[PDB]
């Protein structure tokens, strides 16, 4: 269904970001800035720095491709 998107990020995260976005047509009308925050949990900071508990982090930030890189 989405050969181009399923190879950059992998089909798993591809499904996680297309299902939550309301479909491929829905996210095609969506800016990349908003596509970053797809499934971005507003995790409750447990008395920590907001940097420690990843703020503004979405499924794309948890994809295998990005996690291969150093945290910075």
């Amino acid at each position: 269904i989405a050969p181009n998107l399923s190879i950059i990020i992998g089909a798993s995260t591809a499904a996680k970001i297309m299902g939550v976005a309301g479909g491929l047509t829905n996210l095609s009308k969506m800016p990349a800035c908003n596509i970053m925050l797809l499934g971005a949990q507003r995790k409750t900071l447990s008395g920590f720095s907001s940097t420690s508990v990843l703020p503004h982090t979405g499924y794309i930030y948890h994809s295998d491709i990005v996690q291969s890189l150093p945290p910075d």
């Binding site: 996690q67 291969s68 890189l69 150093p70 945290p71």
Partner: protein, 456 residues
């Protein structure tokens, strides 16, 4: 004869008797006729009028005592023998009478035993008391326990008396005290769920001299290397017993091919002629091992670029890959290096894996905290033997039995032991008196130091 009945039977206190101390007179420092009071639990010199036991009996009004040699009870203030049905239980504590059926019906035992104090436990799974830096001693004693070939030779006192003891034999006390301690810990019915090796570390420090002093934490590998050797040497007086009860259990034949002078200081042509000389080549160096040594990769020494401070996990088969003709280790020493390749030619019934964690650098001794991923109930070692020997063994699979894990720096350590209760699968963690049925994953997560196997 009022000997059989006594009006002082109830005064006996069973939870106070701590029979793990030295059986020498407290008042006058003697081992002869060591008599123990049952009311309070003190040692004395023996029976007789105006004797230390008699003086205590007529002073504290403690009547019924116990003989530690004849195992026959006495009432000292009138000094007559005492016989009772219930009292027999006490005699089972200091000298447990493990008849052969109880040995034969102990690997099939799955009932938690009863202690007088109420502290439940399983036999064999017993906490050895850490009096003074006995963590390594307790660890090695527990690891040596749970070995059925060694388990079935010491639960009976009639196994090691018949051995020949020369006039200069000064190490049989080690064997007999090991046997007695094992009987104390393997006891189904004892007042305390723990046991003190107080009578055992004394024999250890007598046989090993000041070495392995209980003041400072000893080294596990350095310990059992001497301990198994001492057990082998004690069994047999003035008679070469190449195979004794401990030799045919852990010892295995090993082949070594060793080449020497590979030193880089030699030029290419000179080294080519040297290997051409046929003087410096692989040699027939077959010998015996009491335990297989495991050499680990060095610590990463650097943070991983993605996940900093990554824990180094190495599969066990990488370590065991040393024992084959494929790999060869350079045990360099003094001026010239020595390239040795190892090989296995006789798998012992139980395989011991010592792990070289603690090593001295050029300046200071450190530890190698490299975790190892190792299975516990399925491993194959058939690739490490020559086929002309592989046909002999139809069992090359081993199951873990005991595991040793060390804590912290060499100068500050605290041994912990993972024991497998045979018959069941409960892996129990013992440090000093700890008892906890862990899962088969915490054994992999922790860093192992000494492993015990079974070829089945």
């Amino acid at each position: 004869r009022r000997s059989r009945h006594c009006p002082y039977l109830d005064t006996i206190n069973r939870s106070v008797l701590d029979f793990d101390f030295e059986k020498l007179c407290s008042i006058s420092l003697s081992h002869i006729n060591a008599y123990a009071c049952l009311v309070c639990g003190k040692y004395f010199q023996g029976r007789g009028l105006k004797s230390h036991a008699y003086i205590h009996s007529v002073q504290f009004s403690h009547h019924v005592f116990l003989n530690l040699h004849t195992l026959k009870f006495y009432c000292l203030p009138d000094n007559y023998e005492i016989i009772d049905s219930s009292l027999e239980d006490i005699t089972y504590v200091l000298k447990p009478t493990f008849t052969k059926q109880q040995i034969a019906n102990l690997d099939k035992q799955a009932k938690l035993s009863r202690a007088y104090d109420g502290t439940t436990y399983l036999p064999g799974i017993v906490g050895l008391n850490n009096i003074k830096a006995n963590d390594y001693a307790n660890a090695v004693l527990q690891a040596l326990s749970n070995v059925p070939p060694l388990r079935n030779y010491f639960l009976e006192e009639d196994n090691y008396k018949n051995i020949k003891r020369p006039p200069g034999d000064i190490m049989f006390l080690l064997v007999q005290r090991f046997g007695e301690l094992m009987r104390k810990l393997w006891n189904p019915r004892n007042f305390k769920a723990h046991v003190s090796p107080h009578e055992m570390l004394q024999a250890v420090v007598l046989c090993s001299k000041k070495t392995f002093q209980i003041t400072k934490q000893g080294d596990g590998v350095d310990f059992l290397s001497w301990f198994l050797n001492a057990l082998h040497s004690a069994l047999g007086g003035t008679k070469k017993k190449k195979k004794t009860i401990v030799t045919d259990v852990f010892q295995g034949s090993m082949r070594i091919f060793t080449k020497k002078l590979p030193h880089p200081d030699l030029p290419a042509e000179e080294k080519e002629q040297l290997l051409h000389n046929d003087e410096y080549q692989e040699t027939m160096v077959e010998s015996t091992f009491m335990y297989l040594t495991l050499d680990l990769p060095t610590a990463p020494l650097y943070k991983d670029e993605k996940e900093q401070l990554i824990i180094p996990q190495v599969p066990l088969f990488n370590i065991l890959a040393k024992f084959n003709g494929i790999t060869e280790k350079e045990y360099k020493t003094y001026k010239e290096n020595f390239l040795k390749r190892f090989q296995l030619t006789k798998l012992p019934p139980y395989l011991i894996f010592c792990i070289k964690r603690f090593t001295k650098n050029n300046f200071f001794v450190e530890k190698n905290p490299t975790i190892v991923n190792f299975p516990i109930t399925n491993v194959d070692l058939r690739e490490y033997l020559s086929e002309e020997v592989q046909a002999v063994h139809k069992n090359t699979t081993y199951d873990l039995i005991a595991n040793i894990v060390h804590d912290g720096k060499p100068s500050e350590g605290s041994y912990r032991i993972h024991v497998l209760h045979h018959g069941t699968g409960k892996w129990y963690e013992l440090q000093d008196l700890q008892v906890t049925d862990i899962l088969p994953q915490m054994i992999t997560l922790s860093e192992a130091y000494i492993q015990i196997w079974k070829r089945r």
